Design an enzyme around this catalytic site. Structure first.
Site, PDB file in Angstrom:
ATOM      1  N   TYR A  39      18.361  31.314 -87.669  1.00  0.00           N
ATOM      2  CA  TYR A  39      18.279  30.036 -88.402  1.00  0.00           C
ATOM      3  C   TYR A  39      16.969  30.011 -89.172  1.00  0.00           C
ATOM      4  CZ  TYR A  39      21.808  26.382 -88.309  1.00  0.00           C
ATOM      5  OH  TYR A  39      22.926  25.652 -88.548  1.00  0.00           O
ATOM      6  N   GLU A  68      16.333  27.634 -92.187  1.00  0.00           N
ATOM      7  CA  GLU A  68      16.305  26.547 -93.184  1.00  0.00           C
ATOM      8  C   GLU A  68      14.978  26.438 -93.893  1.00  0.00           C
ATOM      9  OE1 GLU A  68      18.555  22.828 -92.284  1.00  0.00           O
ATOM     10  OE2 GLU A  68      18.430  23.636 -90.278  1.00  0.00           O
ATOM     11  N   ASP A  98      27.879  30.485-116.671  1.00  0.00           N
ATOM     12  CA  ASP A  98      28.393  30.995-115.408  1.00  0.00           C
ATOM     13  C   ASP A  98      28.977  32.328-115.762  1.00  0.00           C
ATOM     14  OD1 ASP A  98      29.964  31.641-113.102  1.00  0.00           O
ATOM     15  OD2 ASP A  98      30.918  29.682-113.101  1.00  0.00           O
ATOM     16  N   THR A 119      28.431  34.736-109.040  1.00  0.00           N
ATOM     17  CA  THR A 119      28.860  35.255-107.756  1.00  0.00           C
ATOM     18  C   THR A 119      28.368  36.673-107.637  1.00  0.00           C
ATOM     19  OG1 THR A 119      30.950  35.978-108.763  1.00  0.00           O
ATOM     20  CG2 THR A 119      30.947  33.844-107.726  1.00  0.00           C
ATOM     21  N   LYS A 150      32.210  40.031-107.451  1.00  0.00           N
ATOM     22  CA  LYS A 150      33.201  40.443-108.424  1.00  0.00           C
ATOM     23  C   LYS A 150      32.759  41.747-109.071  1.00  0.00           C
ATOM     24  CE  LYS A 150      34.795  35.727-109.373  1.00  0.00           C
ATOM     25  NZ  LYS A 150      33.863  34.898-108.590  1.00  0.00           N
ATOM     26  N   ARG A 201      30.191  38.531-100.671  1.00  0.00           N
ATOM     27  CA  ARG A 201      30.627  37.235-101.177  1.00  0.00           C
ATOM     28  C   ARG A 201      29.463  36.241-101.064  1.00  0.00           C
ATOM     29  NH1 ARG A 201      36.216  37.692-101.945  1.00  0.00           N
ATOM     30  NH2 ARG A 201      36.227  35.573-102.822  1.00  0.00           N
TER      31      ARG A 201
HETATM   32  C1  LIG Z   1      15.817  21.390 -90.543  1.00  0.00           C
HETATM   33  C2  LIG Z   1      16.764  20.358 -89.969  1.00  0.00           C
HETATM   34  N1  LIG Z   1      18.012  20.147 -90.431  1.00  0.00           N
HETATM   35  N2  LIG Z   1      18.689  19.123 -89.753  1.00  0.00           N
HETATM   36  C3  LIG Z   1      17.839  18.726 -88.818  1.00  0.00           C
HETATM   37  C4  LIG Z   1      16.554  19.406 -88.838  1.00  0.00           C
HETATM   38  C5  LIG Z   1      15.435  19.099 -87.882  1.00  0.00           C
HETATM   39  C6  LIG Z   1      14.172  18.786 -88.636  1.00  0.00           C
HETATM   40  C7  LIG Z   1      12.931  18.753 -87.991  1.00  0.00           C
HETATM   41  C8  LIG Z   1      11.759  18.419 -88.650  1.00  0.00           C
HETATM   42  C9  LIG Z   1      10.655  18.411 -88.015  1.00  0.00           C
HETATM   43  N3  LIG Z   1       9.661  18.403 -87.444  1.00  0.00           N
HETATM   44  C10 LIG Z   1      11.787  18.099 -90.023  1.00  0.00           C
HETATM   45  C11 LIG Z   1      13.031  18.105 -90.666  1.00  0.00           C
HETATM   46  C12 LIG Z   1      13.266  17.862 -92.103  1.00  0.00           C
HETATM   47  C13 LIG Z   1      14.161  18.533 -92.906  1.00  0.00           C
HETATM   48  C14 LIG Z   1      14.174  18.129 -94.228  1.00  0.00           C
HETATM   49  C15 LIG Z   1      13.262  17.125 -94.447  1.00  0.00           C
HETATM   50  S1  LIG Z   1      13.152  16.560 -95.991  1.00  0.00           S
HETATM   51  O1  LIG Z   1      14.517  16.539 -96.392  1.00  0.00           O
HETATM   52  O2  LIG Z   1      12.562  17.583 -96.821  1.00  0.00           O
HETATM   53  N4  LIG Z   1      12.384  15.238 -96.269  1.00  0.00           N
HETATM   54  C16 LIG Z   1      12.920  14.177 -95.444  1.00  0.00           C
HETATM   55  C17 LIG Z   1      10.961  15.420 -95.968  1.00  0.00           C
HETATM   56  S2  LIG Z   1      12.384  16.704 -93.025  1.00  0.00           S
HETATM   57  C18 LIG Z   1      14.194  18.441 -89.975  1.00  0.00           C
HETATM   58  C19 LIG Z   1      15.265  20.276 -86.878  1.00  0.00           C
HETATM   59  C20 LIG Z   1      16.508  20.564 -86.016  1.00  0.00           C
HETATM   60  C21 LIG Z   1      14.730  21.604 -87.454  1.00  0.00           C
HETATM   61  C22 LIG Z   1      15.739  17.777 -87.151  1.00  0.00           C
HETATM   62  C23 LIG Z   1      14.810  17.220 -86.477  1.00  0.00           C
HETATM   63  N5  LIG Z   1      13.965  16.709 -85.860  1.00  0.00           N
HETATM   64  C24 LIG Z   1      16.951  17.173 -87.188  1.00  0.00           C
HETATM   65  N6  LIG Z   1      17.200  16.031 -86.537  1.00  0.00           N
HETATM   66  O3  LIG Z   1      18.068  17.745 -87.916  1.00  0.00           O
HETATM   67  C1  LIG Z   2      24.994  18.546 -85.785  1.00  0.00           C
HETATM   68  C2  LIG Z   2      24.852  19.580 -86.885  1.00  0.00           C
HETATM   69  N1  LIG Z   2      25.748  19.593 -87.884  1.00  0.00           N
HETATM   70  C3  LIG Z   2      25.708  20.476 -88.902  1.00  0.00           C
HETATM   71  C4  LIG Z   2      24.760  21.484 -89.048  1.00  0.00           C
HETATM   72  C5  LIG Z   2      24.884  22.352 -90.293  1.00  0.00           C
HETATM   73  O1  LIG Z   2      25.081  23.744 -90.060  1.00  0.00           O
HETATM   74  P1  LIG Z   2      24.716  24.798 -91.207  1.00  0.00           P
HETATM   75  O2  LIG Z   2      23.250  25.063 -90.973  1.00  0.00           O
HETATM   76  O3  LIG Z   2      25.618  25.935 -90.815  1.00  0.00           O
HETATM   77  O4  LIG Z   2      24.960  24.104 -92.512  1.00  0.00           O
HETATM   78  C6  LIG Z   2      23.694  21.602 -88.004  1.00  0.00           C
HETATM   79  C7  LIG Z   2      22.584  22.653 -88.048  1.00  0.00           C
HETATM   80  N2  LIG Z   2      21.298  22.096 -87.693  1.00  0.00           N
HETATM   81  C8  LIG Z   2      20.147  22.952 -87.524  1.00  0.00           C
HETATM   82  C9  LIG Z   2      19.739  23.140 -86.065  1.00  0.00           C
HETATM   83  O5  LIG Z   2      20.183  22.400 -85.162  1.00  0.00           O
HETATM   84  O6  LIG Z   2      18.941  24.044 -85.798  1.00  0.00           O
HETATM   85  C10 LIG Z   2      23.755  20.602 -86.893  1.00  0.00           C
HETATM   86  O7  LIG Z   2      22.851  20.631 -85.900  1.00  0.00           O
HETATM   87  C1  LIG Z   3      33.512  31.805-113.379  1.00  0.00           C
HETATM   88  C2  LIG Z   3      33.660  31.514-111.901  1.00  0.00           C
HETATM   89  N1  LIG Z   3      32.744  30.752-111.272  1.00  0.00           N
HETATM   90  C3  LIG Z   3      32.798  30.441-109.964  1.00  0.00           C
HETATM   91  C4  LIG Z   3      33.806  30.877-109.102  1.00  0.00           C
HETATM   92  C5  LIG Z   3      33.744  30.448-107.648  1.00  0.00           C
HETATM   93  O1  LIG Z   3      33.599  31.563-106.755  1.00  0.00           O
HETATM   94  P1  LIG Z   3      34.001  31.415-105.223  1.00  0.00           P
HETATM   95  O2  LIG Z   3      35.448  31.822-105.246  1.00  0.00           O
HETATM   96  O3  LIG Z   3      33.108  32.394-104.538  1.00  0.00           O
HETATM   97  O4  LIG Z   3      33.831  29.950-104.920  1.00  0.00           O
HETATM   98  C6  LIG Z   3      34.892  31.749-109.653  1.00  0.00           C
HETATM   99  C7  LIG Z   3      36.034  32.245-108.776  1.00  0.00           C
HETATM  100  N2  LIG Z   3      37.034  32.918-109.567  1.00  0.00           N
HETATM  101  C8  LIG Z   3      38.413  33.065-109.134  1.00  0.00           C
HETATM  102  C9  LIG Z   3      38.998  34.287-109.838  1.00  0.00           C
HETATM  103  O5  LIG Z   3      38.626  34.546-111.003  1.00  0.00           O
HETATM  104  O6  LIG Z   3      39.819  35.013-109.257  1.00  0.00           O
HETATM  105  C10 LIG Z   3      34.810  32.070-111.122  1.00  0.00           C
HETATM  106  O7  LIG Z   3      35.735  32.849-111.745  1.00  0.00           O
END
Ligand SMILES: Cc1[nH]nc2c1[C@](c1cc(C#N)cc(-c3ccc(S(=O)(=O)N(C)C)s3)c1)(C(C)C)C(C#N)=C(N)O2
Ligand SMILES: Cc1ncc(COP(=O)(O)O)c(CNCC(=O)O)c1O
Ligand SMILES: Cc1ncc(COP(=O)(O)O)c(CNCC(=O)O)c1O
Ligand SMILES: Cc1[nH]nc2c1[C@](c1cc(C#N)cc(-c3ccc(S(=O)(=O)N(C)C)s3)c1)(C(C)C)C(C#N)=C(N)O2
Ligand SMILES: [Cl-]
Lengths: 442, 442
Positions: free
Chosen positions: B54, B56, B208, B234, B237, B243
């Protein structure tokens, strides 16, 4: 007319960093609550030629030729998913295409409410996710606060969901969706109560169970499927699958939700599915259903309970003073140090964790806690006995952080000056590395 | 506390389908214009343990510990992207985190215009993408027509971009962004002219280049970087990467676009990056820059030119009567058959292609063409001479489709009845397999 030299030969520069990362992973005590370690099987899928295929649409309804074997893989994955969460394919449906958690959530919320639609979510500081409508006084941080009209509920000072506040908010604000299930919440969720509040205002009940999915699957914690309209979850956290997501929809509670969710995923937001992802999700979901993985999930809680206990026994404060699940939030106020500082110290010793807010925190930069979790180390075979050791290392890291702040000051740049060459950090890292490097490593 | 058996042993059911799918790829003439075949190295990255992490945020600004090697991988990838497209790291920036083409586009569009913002894109039927603002009188099909206000420009009856119409539209509509670069457009693009129309209205120039990225990289077609504010592509292709997707932003033309694009990707839309993707992209972008990949790309166009020539020599009509790139759209009107019928016929003989609209079409159900392209087969070592054979097979496929329609009728369910056990289809498939199964296969 291509290059077939293995990775080591074709790109030695990159292969090194990867070898480096692999050694670091092997030699770290990984306490990131959202991380895990995929077996060789899940990784064989992710690297399969199946990712060559374009297959926009759904199985049997593809916009491309030669999708016969892809349809079987997508269909098996949806089957194994509904299996894993003990839901009948008649009552519940699933989309297996969302690329990640944040994607799944945005797609699902839109399916339900549309643009300008009203949503309710727990505040980030209180343990809510970004995609649960997060915004700040300054900017609409998440698209979920911008493409939607969102309002955020904070937990009480003790750090528990304030159900009273949720209702008060739901009655005046009149949302179409209420989000529960969280990113850094250490307690279980009263879905039944959420369902009650949603019924009162005619809102959908959205449960995001990404952090706790394995518990739900193995019947160790509350089951949101009993009450929820929508269940989303990532596959990479406690579930121990690849990086991907799932959207579950209750067909019985909402007829024609199936079409809404599916068209939200494609073609509202996504193009071609990532078939290696789906293939890997399928593989992991077989393992999810076995009583063997249930054992692992139980071990996660057993380690989490024990680690909580060991930390309290060393006079370290915890949000809610314990945990019902895989994760703990350590309140660092009594030590007058930040999570940011503690993250650095832990990184210097090969301890992976993240800084985390606490209920008292008002500023997201300069936060008062770290978050930890047991799924990764439990995967490596660590038992309850091992948790005292992790607690000991965390304790010593906290102390070193206090000392280094005393010497170098409150500034983080000043603070980092203290980390290289520190005799205690070196001995501690040596201790961490020695123990970490020996553990079973998938 | 994991199961480490290889995929064959752990999941025999799933390993069969992947072995099934693998054989199909080897034994297919793959004419899907957007497909390719990734080498062993790209697929080794996709299956690497780096997907456990992870991370972010952006390199050096991570919300997690343990990201030192991940920061080097992300930095290498952005460097190699800017190198590949011959842009100086001073003038141009790149975000390497978007999960796929559709995600990248929605993200980049929002960065530029926000919710309710105005955008212009080519209509789907004229060869535009879904993410270019696509909708219908009935429904706002793409989020890009919903979260944004969109207007769609059509090509002329010959099938070429009508630049006059673009300007007429821009003056009335006053968009904030104009999208060019397309999914099924067989000609090169006058970006310079798009630039002059954008300047009159003070709109951003969005190119694009997903379909034609390799051409742009190797200086074989027009370079949109000379004129465009934003360039998306992308990686899967013609580029022949994993991907994934890339957003390019002109810092010099637009200072502080860097922050806008980056905050749109995170935290506006995505959460944790997929590091295995980022790693795979890096490995492929190395190859892109080499003179050897230029050779491959040159072969793509040479094959497409030859394939166009041979199809015309057999009295098959092409949209715009030729191609400047990797792709051809065949106008099936003189045969009184649909693209959907031809797709099934070609699927029955192991020829992978897709149904495609033509300018005359007013309905996406029952389209009048198929789209084809050379990148995959070029990758497999086919040269100009081979293109006569491909053309012959398609010709025979059109004929068989005409006969089968004559026997079974116009309904697709009826048409499919004719396919199994058909003597000439069997003979054609066998011809396809014998040739395809023998070619180099990464
Ligand atoms: C990065 C992230 N995504 N969703 C998450 C996190 C955590 C988080 C923690 C901490 C701390 N300390 C700070 C953040 C922020 C992420 C993004 C911002 S911001 O968008 O740039 N802006 C508001 C300043 S602040 C987010 C954790 C799990 C890492 C968080 C926590 N705590 C929770 N709850 O949820
Ligand atoms: C409740 C919840 N939902 C959605 C996501 C989104 O997953 P993607 O990062 O795959 O977009 C997270 C990840 N949260 C970061 C963490 O807990 O470390 C989460 O904790
Ligand atoms: C110009 C263009 N932009 C964006 C995308 C989006 O890509 P993802 O499929 O990864 O979302 C495609 C997909 N093109 C479908 C095809 O030509 O077969 C595309 O042709
Ligand atoms: C699937 C897709 N995505 N973006 C693409 C395609 C192609 C397309 C072709 C054909 C055909 N025949 C039909 C479509 C549609 C996909 C989705 C719809 S719909 O939104 O659900 N609704 C309008 C019915 S229509 C889309 C090609 C490349 C397959 C297309 C073409 N042609 C172009 N230009 O761009
Ligand atoms: Cl992937």
């Amino acid at each position: 007319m291509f290059n077939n030299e293995p990775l080591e030969q074709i790109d030695k520069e990159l292969h090194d960093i990867l070898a480096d990362e692999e050694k670091r992973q092997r030699e770290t005590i990984n306490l990131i609550a959202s991380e895990n370690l995929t077996n060789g099987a899940v990784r064989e899928c992710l690297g399969n030629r199946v990712s060559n295929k374009y297959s926009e649409g759904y199985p049997k309804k593809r916009y491309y030729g030669g999708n016969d074997f892809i349809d079987k893989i997508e269909e098996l994955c949806q089957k194994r998913a509904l299996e894993a969460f003990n839901v009948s394919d008649e009552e519940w449906g699933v989309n297996v295409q969302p690329l990640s958690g944040s994607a799944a959530n945005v797609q699902a919320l839109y399916a339900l409410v549309g643009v300008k639609g009203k949503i309710m979510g727990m505040h980030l500081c209180s343990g809510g996710h970004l995609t649960h409508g997060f915004f700040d006084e300054k900017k609409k941080v998440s698209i979920t606060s911008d493409m939607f009209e969102s309002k955020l509920y904070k937990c009480n000072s003790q750090g528990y969901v304030d159900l009273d506040a949720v209702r008060e908010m739901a009655l005046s604000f009149k949302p179409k969706v209420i989000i529960c299930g969280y990113t850094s919440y250490p307690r279980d969720i009263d879905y039944q109560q959420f369902r009650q509040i949603c019924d009162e205002v005619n809102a959908y009940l959205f449960a995001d169970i990404s952090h706790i999915s394995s518990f739900v699957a193995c019947n160790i914690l509350n089951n949101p499927f009993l009450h929820a309209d929508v269940v989303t979850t990532t596959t990479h956290k406690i579930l121990r699958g690849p990086r991907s997501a799932l959207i579950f929809f209750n067909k019985k509670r909402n007829p024609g939700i199936e079409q809404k969710i599916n068209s939200a995923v494609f073609p509202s937001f996504q193009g071609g599915p990532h078939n290696n992802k789906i293939a890997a999700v399928a593989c992991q979901l077989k393992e999810v259903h076995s009583p063997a993985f249930k054992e692992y999930t139980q071990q996660v809680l057993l380690n989490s309970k024990a680690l909580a206990k060991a930390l309290i026994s060393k006079q370290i404060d915890l949000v809610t003073n314990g945990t019902d699940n895989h994760l703990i939030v350590v309140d660092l106020r009594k030590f007058s140090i930040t999570g940011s500082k503690l993250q650095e110290t832990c990184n210097a010793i090969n301890v992976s964790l993240n800084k985390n807010t606490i209920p008292s925190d008002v500023d997201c930069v300069s936060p008062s806690g770290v978050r930890i979790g047991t799924p990764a180390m439990t995967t490596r075979g660590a038992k309850e006995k091992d948790m005292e050791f992790i607690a000991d290392v965390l304790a010593r890291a906290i102390k070193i952080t206090v000392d280094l702040q005393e010497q170098y000051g409150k500034k983080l740049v000043d603070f980092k000056k203290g980390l290289p060459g520190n005799a205690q950090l070196q001995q501690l890292k040596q201790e961490v590395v020695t123990w970490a490097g020996a553990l079973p490593f998938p």
